[PDB]
Design a protein around this ligand. Structure first.
Ligand SMILES: [Mg+2]
Ligand SMILES: [Mg+2]
Ligand SMILES: [Mg+2]
Ligand SMILES: [Mg+2]
Ligand SMILES: [Mg+2]
Ligand SMILES: [Mg+2]
Ligand SMILES: [Mg+2]
Ligand SMILES: [Mg+2]
Ligand SMILES: [Mg+2]
Ligand SMILES: [Mg+2]
Ligand SMILES: [Mg+2]
Ligand SMILES: [Mg+2]
Ligand SMILES: [Mg+2]
Ligand SMILES: [Mg+2]
Ligand SMILES: [Mg+2]
Ligand SMILES: [Mg+2]
Ligand SMILES: [Mg+2]
Ligand SMILES: [Mg+2]
Ligand SMILES: [Mg+2]
Ligand SMILES: [Mg+2]
Ligand SMILES: [Mg+2]
Ligand SMILES: [Mg+2]
Ligand SMILES: [Mg+2]
Ligand SMILES: [Mg+2]
Ligand SMILES: [Mg+2]
Ligand SMILES: [Mg+2]
Ligand SMILES: [Mg+2]
Ligand SMILES: [Mg+2]
Ligand SMILES: [Mg+2]
Ligand SMILES: [Mg+2]
Ligand SMILES: [Mg+2]
Ligand SMILES: [Mg+2]
Ligand SMILES: [Mg+2]
Ligand SMILES: [Mg+2]
Ligand SMILES: [Mg+2]
Ligand SMILES: [Zn+2]
Lengths: 52, 105, 60, 50, 122, 135, 86, 134
RNA sequence: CGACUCUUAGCGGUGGAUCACUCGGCUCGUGCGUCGAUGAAGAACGCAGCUAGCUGCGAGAAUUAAUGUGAAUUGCAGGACACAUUGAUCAUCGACACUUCGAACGCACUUGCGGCCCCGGGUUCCUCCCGGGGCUACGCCUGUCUGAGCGUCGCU
RNA sequence: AGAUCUUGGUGGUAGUAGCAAAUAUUCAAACGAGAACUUUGAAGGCCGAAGUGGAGAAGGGUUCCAUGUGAACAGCAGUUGA
RNA sequence: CUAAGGCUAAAUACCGGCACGAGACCGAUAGUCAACAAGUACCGUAAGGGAAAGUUGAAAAGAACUUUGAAGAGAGAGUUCA
RNA sequence: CGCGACCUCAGAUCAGACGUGGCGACCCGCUGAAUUUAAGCAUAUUAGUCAGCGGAGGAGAAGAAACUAACCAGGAUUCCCUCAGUAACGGCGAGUGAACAGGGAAGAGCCCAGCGCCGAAUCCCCGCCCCGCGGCGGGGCGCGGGACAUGUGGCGUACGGAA
């Protein structure tokens, strides 16, 4: 049971990866290459009002 | 057998260590349990401060740490006496007391 | 011939037969069967007839 | 032997009573999974514990 | 034509024992039929009569036990089967009175210096 | 002292364990006497004991016992503690004054063997390998 | 002959059924069970055989009283009460 | 999805519970939908199957609008028997074919005080839910 | 020509691999954390209409009562069950019951044998026989009663 | 692919070794689908009272008795059987 | 600092027990010895040792009936989507 | 030469209670190896470990300084991080090896004996009555028994305490 199942990652690297994922989510080619069927979405950084 | 350059290592694994290995898979559960106990205690003493009694200002002992200052165990009886608080009423009103602490200065 | 409780002795068997069949018994011989049951041969008094006593018991 | 104690005789009585085949109607029960008495003992093949 | 416990609880000891005796006699007749072949109905009635015997006997025992509980209620010493049987350790432990009685010093402390309800402004 | 109970003095092993005589029991004779009194009167609770005399071959102690189920003991606070289940055979768990002295308990630099409650507790703490989730 | 011929001479039982633990290990001549040690008050039990311990430990039998204790614990060992009659 | 930490979603645990359920909850398991008319009349959807109610089969070989009385609720085999739902065996005798109660629909309920009571209880619960969710 | 042998293929045997399945495990975590002289754990023996094992139960013996539920159990048979002058089954389980060994407790057991106090019968109060009921272990605490001592004394 | 590997299965050997310690069987009949072996009768033999006879102890534990069956078992067979 | 007297909850431990939840685990020679009448069958005087063994089908609808055989076992027929 | 008191012992199937045995993963007290490593081996190591014995509880043990320190000082116990594979031990070889300070989880303090004062103020048991039953308590009554001056209770405990 003491296989060392868990890994610790640097906080700065985890924040770096979050920033990279967010930046990639705003590019239509990458979101399309994830196969997300965005061909009629009006604007890729899709923002809606707070009423949602 | 040593192999070229290296550090002379002394592992302390000659004493059947695998019978006594403490895993930590209950660490998140322990943290959750401690948090629930803290919240239950804070609810139980409803207007009283959640952390507990006030602690005295206390200088750290040795020459490494005497520049720092921290929280002690309880206010000394001399401090209570000159502050005009009874040593049996202080703990009722939430003042931690320490009868064995002295005041050198 | 009866199959009786294994803990019942000859006196108890005699009194039980006397009470719940209203017959007088001459003697009781007792064995324990190989299957563990106890078997009692109860010989009745000469004035009591085993044949019609067995009839009124219902084992003819 | 012919001379035996009551405890030994009772033990042999229970062994006799439980050394018998299964009833036929058992195999018609729902979800039986029992074909035969697999605890059958023969006096010459295997000997008793005592 | 079965017998229930509810209408047996009304009856008293004499007729309860009479009915138990009748049930035992009928059970003996049913065993005679079982060994002499008999009929399927008479074989199936064996369980009915046995459970009726159990019913009468449990009613008798419950009535007797509750009568004894009434008789021994309010007495210092009671039979062991009438005393409670929580657990051996639960019976050994202290009772509520001597569990919570205090010393005069202790209650003087509680009287003089009771814990206060307070709040601390930030 | 405690002679090693081996036949003919033969302790089959390395010479460091060949000792039969000059060996000493870890607990004192007062603790042994308390243990014997408690074992005989297992329905009582050992409280303490004291020395009343000695010979060249015998030591005499007097052991105080408490009947925990007597009403005078049981109805008295400051005495009700001895009646708790956790306080039975204190002399056999080494919790009386005499039996406690052999455990090496105490505060300070002379008693580092038993930090944690006892020698076995300290040994388990010091010989347990803490393998955290994140190494 | 130390083998087949000598096996014909065994007609005297060393052990019999033990009135405690019901095992055929009651040495008659020593009057003691080799499995439980019956005339001794305490059960014979050794930590060098965990298999032997788990063969006869608690739960391997009926637990007639412990089943009832486990059930009764869930309601605080209540006694003297009955469900509200209908 | 499921959020209660005391109900399991383990497949083996659920199957063990289902196949070792005692009869008084096998009764709840062996429930059938009511017909559209009965669902209208009594404001309930489903009902545990019962000895003497009339059902029709909606799945399997015996599909049809023919109505048959239940004649047996074999809870050990999780099946029910219906009047004309049967087949001939080799020696010419007829045997009932057991079908699951979820594959029938109840067209007439065997009504007594207990069935009526359960009907109003289910209806009241559904009405309370509708009023809460309105 | 045939036999026999070898190779390959089709089919058939033998065998139970592979695959798919899984009311089982293993591991981790959580909450409780409760045995026993009021007789435990363990053991033995019995208990079903047809029942050997497993399971359940204890001479009230594959279970009684009570409560909840609400028409079955089911291998066959049988018979209940107006489901309201109350209910099958199942679950729960708080009432009752719970054979013999076993710390095991009258003494003893690879067998058996007592003693004491009541009650019933044969006797026809007196204690012989039979049956039933209740007692009869060791250690130890408080108290009680009966005592012992050329132990220390007092009075005579 | 190996570990005189672990578990399971299967070959050649091979229809082979073998079913050879203690003298011995034969005739007719019955039952039966079926008889070298079962039963009955006749004959010839053996144990030869320190028995291949009649009964017990220990041990076995239902093997005892009757009826029926002919799957498997009784190293051939069986209508017989512990 | 004040021994040779005493008590004291919380934080801590938990491969036994009761009841649960889960898993980048194993998938019937694996995973517990034990998925199954498993600490069972069986072995040993005893201490003790200790297995093998899952799967018809949706539903028994588990092959009526005819026919050869003394039967096992076959040929037809029949159930089934098979 | 009897009757009393006390002391020290004994018996009882005396009245009423209590202990025994099981489980034993975790915990407490003891006892306690050898395989192994040292490329041999004896000290050492394995290891205060396996096995063995006893005793508990839902936790246990510990615990409110005859402490740490040497500072401008901290302040019961227990657990975690670190100190630290360090100080030290060791055929100074193989190997073994803590603590203080610091940061946290938790946090809670107290009681006798003794010295004294108070007309033993104290306690148990048995009867009677009432209020309760549900773990058997409350209140009162007894020229009712016993314990106890060879010391019970109240005040009081090193932080001082009392009048
Ligand atoms: Mg006889
Ligand atoms: Mg033999
Ligand atoms: Mg005081
Ligand atoms: Mg050495
Ligand atoms: Mg030899
Ligand atoms: Mg001998
Ligand atoms: Mg093939
Ligand atoms: Mg009932
Ligand atoms: Mg004798
Ligand atoms: Mg004198
Ligand atoms: Mg291979
Ligand atoms: Mg290779
Ligand atoms: Mg040949
Ligand atoms: Mg030959
Ligand atoms: Mg001759
Ligand atoms: Mg002879
Ligand atoms: Mg014969
Ligand atoms: Mg043959
Ligand atoms: Mg396996
Ligand atoms: Mg497979
Ligand atoms: Mg054949
Ligand atoms: Mg196919
Ligand atoms: Mg007495
Ligand atoms: Mg070496
Ligand atoms: Mg070497
Ligand atoms: Mg060597
Ligand atoms: Mg050990
Ligand atoms: Mg114990
Ligand atoms: Mg403690
Ligand atoms: Mg302590
Ligand atoms: Mg102090
Ligand atoms: Mg470092
Ligand atoms: Mg060391
Ligand atoms: Mg904190
Ligand atoms: Mg005083
Ligand atoms: Zn034994």
């Amino acid at each position: 049971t003491w296989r060392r199942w868990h890994r610790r990652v640097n906080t700065t690297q985890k924040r770096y990866a979050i920033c990279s994922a967010l930046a990639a989510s705003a590019l239509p080619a990458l979101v399309m290459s994830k196969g997300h069927r965005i061909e009629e979405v009006p604007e890729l950084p899709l923002v809606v009002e707070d009423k949602v | 057998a040593p192999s070229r350059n290296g550090m002379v290592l002394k592992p302390h694994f000659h004493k059947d260590w695998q019978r006594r290995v403490a895993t930590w898979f209950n660490q998140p559960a322990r943290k959750i349990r401690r948090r629930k106990a803290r919240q239950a205690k804070a609810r139980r003493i409803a207007p009283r401060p959640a952390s507990g009694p006030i602690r005295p200002i206390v200088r750290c002992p040795t020459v490494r740490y005497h520049t720092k200052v921290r929280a002690g165990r309880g206010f000394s009886l001399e401090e209570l006496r000159v502050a005009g608080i009874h040593k049996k009423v202080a703990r009722t009103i939430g003042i931690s007391v320490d009868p064995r602490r002295r005041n050198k200065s | 011939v009866f199959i009786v409780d294994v803990k019942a002795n000859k006196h108890q068997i005699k009194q039980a037969v006397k009470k719940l069949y209203d017959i007088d018994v001459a003697k009781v011989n007792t064995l324990i069967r190989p299957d563990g049951e106890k078997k009692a041969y109860v010989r009745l008094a000469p004035d009591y007839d085993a044949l019609d006593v067995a009839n009124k018991i219902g084992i003819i | 032997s012919s001379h035996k104690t009551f405890r030994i005789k009772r033990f042999l009585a229970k062994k006799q009573k439980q050394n018998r085949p299964i009833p036929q109607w058992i195999r018609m029960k729902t979800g039986n999974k029992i074909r035969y008495n697999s605890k059958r003992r023969h006096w010459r093949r295997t000997k008793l514990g005592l | 034509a079965k017998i229930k416990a509810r209408d047996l609880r009304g009856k008293k000891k004499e007729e309860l024992l009479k009915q138990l005796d009748d049930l035992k006699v009928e059970l003996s007749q049913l065993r005679v039929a079982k060994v002499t072949g008999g009929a399927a109905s008479k074989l199936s009635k064996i369980r009915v009569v046995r459970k009726s015997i159990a019913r009468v006997l449990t009613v008798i025992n419950q009535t007797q036990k509750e009568n004894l509980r009434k008789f021994y209620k309010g007495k210092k010493y009671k039979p062991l089967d009438l005393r409670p049987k929580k657990t051996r350790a639960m019976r050994r432990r202290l009772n509520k009175h001597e569990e919570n009685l205090k010393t005069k010093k202790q209650q003087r402390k509680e009287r003089l210096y009771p814990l206060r309800k307070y709040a601390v402004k930030a | 002292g405690r002679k090693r109970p081996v036949p003919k003095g033969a302790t089959y092993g390395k010479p460091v364990h060949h000792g039969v005589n000059q060996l000493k029991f870890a607990r004192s004779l007062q603790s042994v006497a308390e243990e014997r009194a408690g074992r005989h009167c297992g329905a009582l609770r050992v409280l303490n004991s004291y020395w009343v005399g000695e010979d060249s071959t015998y030591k005499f102690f007097e052991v105080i016992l408490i009947d925990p189920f007597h009403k005078a003991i049981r109805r008295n606070p400051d005495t009700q503690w001895i009646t708790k289940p956790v306080h039975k055979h204190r002399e056999m768990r080494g919790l009386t004054s005499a039996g406690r002295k052999s455990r090496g308990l105490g505060k300070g630099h002379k008693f580092h063997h038993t930090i944690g409650g006892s020698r076995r507790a300290a040994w388990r703490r010091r010989n347990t390998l803490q393998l955290h989730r994140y190494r | 002959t130390k083998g087949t011929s000598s096996f014909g001479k065994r007609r005297n039982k060393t052990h019999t059924l033990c009135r405690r633990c019901g095992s055929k290990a009651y040495h008659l001549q020593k009057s003691t069970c080799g499995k439980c040690g019956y005339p001794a008050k305490r059960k014979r039990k050794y930590n060098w055989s965990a298999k032997a311990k788990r063969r006869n430990t608690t739960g391997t039998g009926r637990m007639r009283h412990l089943k009832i204790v486990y059930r009764r614990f869930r309601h605080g060992f209540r006694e003297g009460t009955t469900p509200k009659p209908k | 999805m499921k959020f209660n930490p005391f109900v399991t979603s383990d497949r083996s645990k659920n199957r063990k519970r289902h196949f070792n359920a005692p009869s008084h909850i096998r009764r709840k398991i062996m429930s059938s939908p009511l017909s559209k008319e009965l669902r209208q009349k009594y404001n309930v959807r489903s009902m545990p199957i019962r000895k003497d109610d009339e059902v029709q089969v909606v799945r399997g070989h015996y599909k049809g609008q023919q109505i048959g009385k239940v004649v047996q609720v074999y809870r050990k085999k999780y099946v029910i028997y219906i009047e004309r739902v049967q087949r001939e065996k080799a020696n010419g005798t007829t045997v009932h074919v057991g079908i699951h109660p979820s594959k029938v629909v109840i067209t007439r309920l065997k009504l007594d005080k207990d069935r009526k009571k359960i009907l109003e209880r289910k209806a009241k619960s559904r009405q309370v839910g509708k009023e809460k969710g309105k």
